[PDB]
Amino acid sequence: GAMESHPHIQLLKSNRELLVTHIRNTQCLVDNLLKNDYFSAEDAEIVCACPTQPDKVRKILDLVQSKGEEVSEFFLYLLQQLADAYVDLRPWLLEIGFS
């Protein structure tokens, strides 16, 4: 109930194009592969064949529900702009959640 644990993960996949262009983005999957120990570039590439790379990362955080989601936004933003991206992210997810 209450969508269980689908806050940031849902936001990130919906505004994938927005975040992907931001700088690197790929940092999300590496922290995820660090944390989950198999959602690595290999897992990413295989599934990416359909929903491309950006939806593929949604998938990695999707299964983690917590760690990947938390670390992925944090790490890729470390590169991008913690001040700009992370603080502004709070409005981002609540708006895009759409429910």
From Swiss-Prot:
Transmembrane segments: none annotated. It is found in: Cell membrane; Apical cell membrane; Basolateral cell membrane; Cytoplasm. Palmitoylated. Palmitoylation is required for proper recruitment to the bacterial entry site and hence for proper signaling upon cognate peptidoglycan detection. Residues 4-94 form the CARD domain. Highly expressed in adult heart, skeletal muscle, pancreas, spleen and ovary. Also detected in placenta, lung, liver, kidney, thymus, testis, small intestine and colon. Homooligomer: homooligomerizes following ligand-binding, promoting RIPK2 recruitment. Interacts (via CARD domain) with RIPK2 (via CARD domain). Following RIPK2 recruitment, RIPK2 homooligomerizes via its CARD domain and forms long filaments named RIPosomes. Interacts with ARHGEF2. Interacts (via CARD domain) with ubiquitin; inhibiting interaction with RIPK2. Interacts with NLRP10 and recruits it to the cell membrane following invasive bacterial infection. Interacts with IFIH1; this interaction promotes transcription of antiviral genes and inhibition of viral replication. Pattern recognition receptor (PRR) that detects bacterial peptidoglycan fragments and other danger signals and thus participates in both innate and adaptive immune responses. Specifically recognizes and binds gamma-D-glutamyl-meso-diaminopimelic acid (iE-DAP), a dipeptide present in peptidoglycan of Gram-negative bacteria. Preferentially binds iE-DAP in tripeptide-containing muropeptides (MurNAc-TriDAP or TriDAP). Ligand binding triggers oligomerization that facilitates the binding and subsequent activation of the proximal adapter receptor-interacting RIPK2. The LRR repeats recognize and bind gamma-D-glutamyl-meso-diaminopimelic acid (iE-DAP). Belongs to the NOD1-NOD2 family. This is Nucleotide-binding oligomerization domain-containing protein 1.
